[PDB]
C-alpha cells in the first residue's frame, strides 16, 4: 500500500498523534534543557501562532515519522498541528480565547535539488529549494470556515472548511431543502492571510548556454510579507498538482501546471559607546578617515562628504523664510578618477539613498509619471528618484548627459524643494527634502586650468550655484602617486582571487553614530562672532573685485554656517564654537578659490594663506614646495635634453628661501618627517642637497 493510504486510517493516526505528543513533551537539548519549554514560553510571551521543528531532531527521536514525512506531507502536518495544539493548550488554557490553531513548520532538511530538476517524480512530495524573489501579490483575505445564507429563506448554513484544492459548494439548505443559490455571510465568516510569490533561479548559478527557470509559490497565515522582491530565499514546500484548473483541456496537449505550497522561509550600551567615542578628542579626524576605505587619496573629497552625510539644520522663522540644511556636492573629474565609486560607497552606507544615471535606461527614473506597471498590471503614480529620497540622499551619475526634462526637474527640486505633477487628471505637489550628490566630466574630456569651472562644464551657472561644495579632480602624472595607486589596484586584484587618522571606526558603529547625531544633536548658534565674519566677508569681496572676476556673495556665508553646524554635529556639541567656524571658513575658501582660473587662483591663494592654514600641516606645505621645484626641474630636463635623467636633485637654499617667504625657518623636522621618506626623498649634508 501507499504511505498516504496507511496514514489515512485512524489507528496509526492516533498512535502517531500520541508519539508526537510524547516527542514534544520529552524532547530536550544536548545540555538537558527542555527545548519546547523555552520555545513555547517565548512564543507565549508574544502571542504567536507558529511553531518551528527541525527534521534532524525529529528523525533522531522518531524515525518512522521522519521517513513518512516527505511522501505524505499534508496529513502528517495536520496531525502534528493537532498534537502541538493539544500540548500547548495543556500548557496554557487561554489560547482558546486567542488562537484556536497552531501551525508546525519544518526548518532544516537535506538540501533538495534546484528548480531545474523538479519533474514528475517529485509530485505530492516535500521539497526544499533556493531562489530569488521577483514579485509579490500583497496580502489577500482567503476564506476559511465559511457561513452561507440561503436565498429563499434566511437560514445560516454551518461552517464549512475551505480546502485548497476545490471550492466549497453546499448541497442544499437543511430547512427548505432548496438547491440554491447561496451567498457568503460576510459578517460571520473567518478569513486567512494569503500571498503569492514568483521565484527565479539565482543568475550566478546558471550554467552558460541555458536560461534561468521560474516557479510559483504560495504563503499562508504568518508567512505573509516575510520576503521583499529582489531578495534571495529558501523554501520548504509541497510540489502539487491536485488543484482545479491544472489540466490543459481547451486546446493542445494534456499538460499539467505545477504549484509549490510553502510552509517556511529561510533568508542601550551602544549609546554609551557613542558618547565615549565623542569624548575622544580626535573623533572628527576618525570620521573623516573612515569614509571610502577602498579609494586612495582625495582626502578633501572625503572630508566634504563627511559634512554632506552629517548635514545641518533647516531654519524657517514663521512660515515666511525657509532655509535648507542639506549640503549638496558636485564632482567634476577627468576619466579614470573613480567618481562613481564614491557614489556607490555612499549608497552602501546611507540608510536611504537612491541611485540613478542620466545617460539612459536607469532602473529608477528622474521624473514622475502615471502608468500601468508592467509587472503588477496596476495603475500607479511613480514619482521620481527625488521624491522617493525624503530626508535621504539622491545620487546622479553622468550629470551632463541628462536631457531637458531631467534638468528641469532637478532645477525645480533643488530650488523649490518640491515637485509638481499635472498628468492624467492628477494635480499634486510632493516634498523633495533630499541631498543631491552628482558627478560629471569636462566638456573636452580634460580639465583646462586656464578656464573657469563654468566654462569647463556643460552645465549652466544657475545649476552650479545651487551646490554648496564643488570638487575638481584633475589627472596629473605624478610618478610616486601613480606607483601607489597601481600598487593598490594590483593588490586588490590579487587579494580577490577566488582561491594621519589613528583608527577608522567600524561601519556599523559609524552608522549608529550618524543616526544618533541626526536624531539627538541640535547645535545652537548662540556664540557666533559676527565681527570676524563681517570683516572677512568685506575683505574677500574687496579682493575679488580687485582681481575683477567672480565676486563672492552672501550665499557662501550661509553654506559656512551650515558646515559649521555639521562640524558641531560631529563632536556632539550643543553649541557652536570658533573651531567649527574656522574649519567651515577653510572649506568654503578652498571651494571658492579652486573654481578660479590660474592667475586669480594663485593670487587669492597667496593672499589668503592666513585662513587657509587653519589646522594645516607645515610638512605638507614644504612637500608641496619640493614637488613644485622637482616638477620644474623635470620639465626643464625633458624640454632641453629631450629625455629624463637618472637622478633628480635640488638645492636646499631654494626650499629655505620659499619657506622663509611662507615664514618657516626650520626644516629638520621636515627632514625627519614620514612625508619626506614616503616620497623617497633624501637629504645630503655633504652637498647641502635634496635627492629624489
Amino acid at each position: 500500500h501507499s504511505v498516504r493510504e496507511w496514514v489515512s486510517m485512524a489507528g496509526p493516526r492516533l498512535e502517531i498523534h500520541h508519539r508526537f505528543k510524547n516527542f514534544l513533551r520529552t524532547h530536550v537539548d544536548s545540555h538537558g534543557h527542555n527545548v519546547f519549554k523555552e520555545r513555547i514560553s517565548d512564543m507565549c510571551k508574544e502571542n504567536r501562532e507558529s511553531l518551528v521543528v527541525n527534521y534532524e531532531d525529529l528523525a533522531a527521536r522518531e524515525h518512522v515519522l521522519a521517513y513518512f514525512l516527505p511522501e505524505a506531507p499534508a496529513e502528517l502536518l495536520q496531525i502534528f498541528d493537532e498534537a502541538a495544539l493539544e500540548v500547548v493548550l495543556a500548557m496554557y488554557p487561554k489560547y482558546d480565547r486567542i488562537t484556536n490553531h497552531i501551525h508546525v513548520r519544518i526548518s532544516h532538511l537535506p538540501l533538495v535539488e534546484e528548480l531545474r530538476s523538479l519533474r514528475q517524480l517529485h509530485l505530492n512530495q516535500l521539497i526544499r529549494t533556493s531562489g530569488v524573489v521577483t514579485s509579490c501579490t500583497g496580502v489577500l483575505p482567503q476564506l476559511s470556515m465559511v457561513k452561507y445564507n440561503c436565498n429563499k429563506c434566511n437560514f445560516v448554513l454551518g461552517p464549512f472548511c475551505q480546502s485548497q484544492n476545490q471550492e466549497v459548494k453546499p448541497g442544499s439548505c437543511p430547512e427548505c431543502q432548496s438547491a440554491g443559490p447561496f451567498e457568503v455571510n460576510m459578517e460571520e465568516t473567518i478569513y486567512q492571510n494569503y500571498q503569492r510569490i514568483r521565484i527565479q533561479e539565482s543568475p550566478g548559478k546558471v550554467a552558460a548556454g541555458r536560461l534561468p527557470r521560474s516557479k510559483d509559490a504560495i504563503l499562508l497565515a504568518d508567512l505573509v510579507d516575510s520576503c521583499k522582491p529582489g531578495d534571495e530565499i529558501e523554501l520548504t514546500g509541497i510540489y502539487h498538482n491536485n488543484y482545479d484548473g491544472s489540466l490543459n483541456t481547451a486546446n493542445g496537449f494534456p499538460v499539467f501546471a505545477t504549484v509549490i505550497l510553502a510552509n517556511h522561509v529561510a533568508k542601550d550600551e551602544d549609546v554609551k559607546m557613542i558618547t565615549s567615542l565623542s569624548k575622544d578628542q580626535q573623533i572628527g579626524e576618525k570620521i573623516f578617515a573612515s569614509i571610502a576605505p577602498s579609494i586612495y587619496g582625495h582626502e578633501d573629497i572625503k572630508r566634504g562628504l563627511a559634512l554632506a552625510l552629517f548635514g545641518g539644520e533647516p531654519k524657517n522663522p514663521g512660515g515666511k523664510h525657509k532655509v535648507r540644511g542639506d549640503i549638496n556636492v558636485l564632482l567634476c573629474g577627468d576619466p579614470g578618477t573613480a567618481k562613481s565609486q564614491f557614489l556607490k560607497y555612499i549608497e552602501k552606507v546611507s540608510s536611504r539613498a537612491i541611485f540613478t544615471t542620466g545617460q539612459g535606461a536607469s532602473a529608477v527614473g528622474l521624473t514622475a509619471y502615471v502608468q500601468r506597471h508592467p509587472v503588477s498590471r496596476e495603475w500607479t503614480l511613480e514619482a521620481g528618484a527625488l521624491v522617493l529620497a525624503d530626508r535621504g540622499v539622491c545620487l546622479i551619475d553622468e550629470f551632463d548627459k541628462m536631457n531637458d526634462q531631467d534638468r528641469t526637474s532637478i532645477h525645480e527640486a533643488m530650488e523649490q524643494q518640491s515637485i509638481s505633477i499635472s498628468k492624467a487628471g492628477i494635480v499634486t505637489s510632493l516634498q523633495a527634502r533630499c541631498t543631491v550628490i552628482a558627478a560629471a566630466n569636462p566638456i573636452g574630456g580634460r580639465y583646462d586650468p586656464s578656464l573657469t569651472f563654468s566654462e569647463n562644464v556643460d552645465l549652466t551657472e544657475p545649476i552650479i550655484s545651487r551646490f554648496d561644495i564643488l570638487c575638481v579632480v584633475r589627472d596629473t602624472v605624478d610618478p610616486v602617486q601613480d606607483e601607489m595607486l597601481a600598487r593598490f589596484v594590483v593588490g586588490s586584484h590579487v587579494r580577490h582571487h577566488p582561491s594621519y587618522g589613528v583608527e577608522p571606526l567600524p561601519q556599523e558603529v559609524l552608522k549608529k553614530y550618524i543616526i544618533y547625531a541626526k536624531e539627538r544633536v541640535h547645535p545652537k548658534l548662540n556664540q557666533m562672532d559676527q565681527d570676524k565674519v563681517a570683516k572677512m566677508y568685506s575683505d574677500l569681496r574687496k579682493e575679488s573685485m580687485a582681481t575683477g572676476s567672480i565676486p563672492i556673495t552672501v550665499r557662501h556665508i550661509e553654506s559656512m554656517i551650515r558646515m559649521a553646524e555639521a562640524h558641531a554635529r560631529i563632536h556632539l556639541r550643543d553649541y557652536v564654537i570658533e573651531d567649527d567656524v574656522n574649519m567651515a571658513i577653510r572649506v568654503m575658501l578652498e571651494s571658492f578659490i579652486d573654481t578660479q582660473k590660474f592667475s586669480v587662483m594663485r593670487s587669492m591663494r597667496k593672499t589668503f594663506a592666513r585662513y587657509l592654514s587653519f589646522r594645516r600641516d607645515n610638512n605638507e606645505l614644504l612637500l608641496f614646495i619640493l614637488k613644485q621645484l622637482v616638477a620644474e626641474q623635470v620639465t626643464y630636463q625633458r624640454n632641453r635634453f629631450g629625455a629624463q635623467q637618472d637622478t633628480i636633485e635640488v638645492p636646499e637654499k631654494d626650499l629655505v628661501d620659499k619657506a622663509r617667504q611662507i615664514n618657516i625657518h626650520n626644516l629638520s623636522a621636515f627632514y625627519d618627517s614620514e612625508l619626506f621618506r614616503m616620497n623617497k626623498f633624501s637629504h645630503d649634508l655633504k652637498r647641502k642637497m635634496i635627492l629624489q
Binding site: 436565498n151 443559490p181 451567498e183 502615471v370 495603475w379 500607479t380 503614480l381 487628471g425 492628477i426
Partner: protein, 49 residues
C-alpha cells in the same frame, strides 16, 4: 471599522445604482414591489416561480 490615510489617484464617473426594485410576470402581469437591495457591491437573484 477602520481609519486610513492615503492619496487619491483615480476617480471613476458617477453612476446609478438601485436600492428598491419591482418586477413583473410575463403571463398574468402580476407584480412584486418594494424589494430592498443590499448596500455595497452586492447583486440580486430574481425568483423563478
Amino acid at each position: 471599522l477602520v481609519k486610513i490615510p492615503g492619496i487619491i489617484i483615480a476617480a471613476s464617473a458617477v453612476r446609478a445604482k438601485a436600492t428598491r426594485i419591482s418586477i413583473q410576470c410575463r403571463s398574468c402581469r402580476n407584480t412584486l414591489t418594494n424589494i430592498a437591495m443590499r448596500p455595497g457591491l452586492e447583486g440580486y437573484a430574481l425568483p423563478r416561480k
